[PDB]
């Protein structure tokens, strides 16, 4: 399930509906390298960075 930023809910049968925060987990943008750590910013925005880059 591609969960988004704001949330998803989940219904395992008549078991009650669950809910989930999926914010990031691709580690934002710390920085000590030139650019291969910017993937963190790409892994959080793989729609705007492809065009933004």
């Amino acid at each position: 399930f591609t969960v988004t930023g704001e949330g998803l809910e989940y219904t395992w049968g008549n078991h009650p509906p669950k809910r989930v925060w999926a914010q990031e987990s691709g580690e934002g943008n710390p920085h000590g390298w030139p650019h291969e750590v910017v993937v963190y910013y790409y892994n959080r925005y793989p729609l705007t960075t492809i065009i933004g880059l």
Partner: protein, 430 residues
């Protein structure tokens, strides 16, 4: 001090704004829109349910015809039949052999389940949304009141008077036409009362359960009984309520947008998190503390110590509190970057007390207003690891420069270098 505030529609999280009344001590809010139940304007158009071909017992005239009449029962199908020899417990009983007449009649009737297990159509308008807004206010610490959205309604439950909305996000997740079933609500273009094609949904269409009149397009067609035996061939589509329970569509509490839940209850659509609500409160002035009684906290310092770039209140920051008196001090980040778990912090004479928070920008440069003393809690944050549980407290995502500032200033520098190459040609030119 009537604290107007635009406010995001999102259910399960407080919104701890800050009352900046000029003259007396500020007071924090804690506005948690615990519910967003909607209750649009609607109309019961017709119940439907599966039919029951509750056949009235046919006539059998033994020698000659029995003309049928079109009785006013719903879908009163009746067709005379001849050419029988009805075996009934003694072999046949009518002594003729072709003049033996059989008049079959069958009408449609609501099932007994129609009262209880029944779909239910509606023409759905917009109506007016509600909420059991808790505010554990200030030092009041409690009110859990049911309110409205229309932007002149107060609800003086507790001590505060509060005016909400109207919200800008008018997406009624209900469509215009809706079918409803027990608890599963279907935003279905039900055909109409009075029309529903047999087999299709609404083959039976009763206004309500009590309504003796209805519309039964079931394509009920009687056929003649076979080989001189008493019975009633009723050839009929099983209901469009039979299907619609196993070839249906999915429920709006499983297919809606923008985050809603549903009930067969006042027909609300709970907790629809979308858009903002312009909320404004008139606090009781008695609840205010005058400014000359809270400690003045300035000449302080703030710094993160372990900022968590996350949803749960993982961000923390010590604050070198520099007080005048000792006591409580309400806190808030007027910038929406940082959302804080603590509304209020206790203070001795110029101590230090960490609070918790959550942010969305790697470099959280958010002001913190510690009871009329601003401070930037600048720093840097760390991403977490463990993201599969319910919804956040952060809800502040925005645009969040390490290769943009001198990059684009460098990008510009190429084209800035242009018109200082050009027009210096004008000088070399003269």
């Amino acid at each position: 001090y009537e604290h107007t505030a635009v406010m995001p529609n999102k259910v399960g999280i407080p919104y701890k704004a800050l009352v900046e009344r000029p003259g007396y001590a500020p007071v924090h809010l804690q506005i948690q829109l615990v519910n967003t139940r909607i209750i649009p304007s609607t109309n019961l158009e017709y119940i439907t349910c599966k039919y029951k071909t509750k056949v009235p017992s046919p006539v059998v005239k033994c020698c000659g015809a029995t003309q049928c009449t079109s009785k006013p029962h719903p879908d009163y199908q009746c067709q005379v039949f001849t050419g029988v020899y009805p075996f009934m417990w003694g072999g046949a009983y009518c002594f003729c052999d072709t003049e033996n007449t059989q008049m079959s009649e069958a009408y449609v009737e609501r099932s007994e389940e129609c009262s209880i297990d029944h779909a239910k159509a509606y023409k759905v308008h917009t109506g007016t949304v509600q909420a059991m807004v808790n505010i554990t206010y200030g030092s009041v610490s409690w009110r859990s009141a049911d309110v409205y959205v229309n932007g002149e309604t107060p609800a003086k439950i507790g001590d505060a008077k509060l005016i909400i909305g109207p919200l800008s996000s008018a997406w009624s997740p209900f469509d215009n036409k809706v079918v409803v079933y027990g608890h599963e609500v279907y935003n279905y273009d039900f055909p109409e009362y009075g029309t529903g094609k047999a087999g299709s949904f609404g083959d039976l269409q009763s206004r309500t359960s009590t309504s003796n009149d209805l519309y039964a397009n079931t394509n009920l067609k009687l056929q003649r009984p076979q080989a001189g035996i008493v019975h009633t061939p009723f050839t009929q589509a099983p209901s469009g309520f039979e299907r619609w329970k196993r070839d249906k569509g999915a429920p709006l509490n499983d297919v809606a947008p923008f985050g809603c839940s549903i009930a067969l209850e006042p027909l609300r659509a709970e907790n629809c998190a979308v858009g903002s609500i312009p909320i404004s409160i008139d606090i009781p002035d008695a609840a205010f503390t005058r400014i000359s009684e809270t400690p003045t906290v300035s000449d302080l310092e703030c710094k993160i110590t372990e900022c968590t770039y996350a949803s749960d209140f993982g961000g923390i920051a010590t604050v070198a509190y520099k007080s005048s008196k000792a006591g409580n001090c309400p806190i808030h980040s007027p910038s929406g970057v940082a959302v804080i778990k603590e509304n209020d912090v206790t203070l001795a004479e110029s101590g230090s007390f960490t609070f918790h928070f959550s942010t969305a920008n790697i470099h959280p440069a958010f002001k913190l207003q510690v009871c009329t003393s601003a401070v930037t809690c600048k720093g840097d944050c760390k991403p977490p690891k463990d993201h599969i549980v319910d919804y956040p407290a952060q809800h502040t995502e925005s645009f969040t420069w390490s290769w943009l500032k001198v990059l684009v200033g460098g990008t510009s520098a190429f084209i800035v270098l242009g018109l200082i190459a050009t027009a210096v040609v004008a000088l070399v030119l003269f």
